[PDB]
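Hi,

I'm pasting everything inline rather than attaching a file, because the server keeps stripping attachments. The sequence lines come first, and each chain or strand is labelled.
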Amino acid sequence: GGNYNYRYRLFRKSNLKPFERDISTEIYQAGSTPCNGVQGFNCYFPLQS
Amino acid sequence: GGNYNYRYRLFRKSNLKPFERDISTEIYQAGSTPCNGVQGFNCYFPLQS
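And the predicted assembly:
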């Protein structure tokens, strides 16, 4: 059926430092509209399976 | 930059009848525990971009 329980980050405001950990799960606003925690246009979840 | 505005359904309890429109956005339960509106382990969003 496929393993869909492994994910990875796909979006961030900036890069990451060496040996740095990011665990925050916030909606990524890639446009000019307040997402307000709404998954939609220019509002993409930062994790992909 | 990649187009992400298009999504398609990936999981459903059953198949679709001919000429059917589905729009429900509900967390899917692939395991034996309630999802409780959290896309965590064995609980995946139905739409993929």
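The interface with chain A takes residues 4-5, 30, 41-42, 44-45, 49 of chain B (CB under 8 Å).

If the labels don't parse on your end, tell me and I'll reformat.
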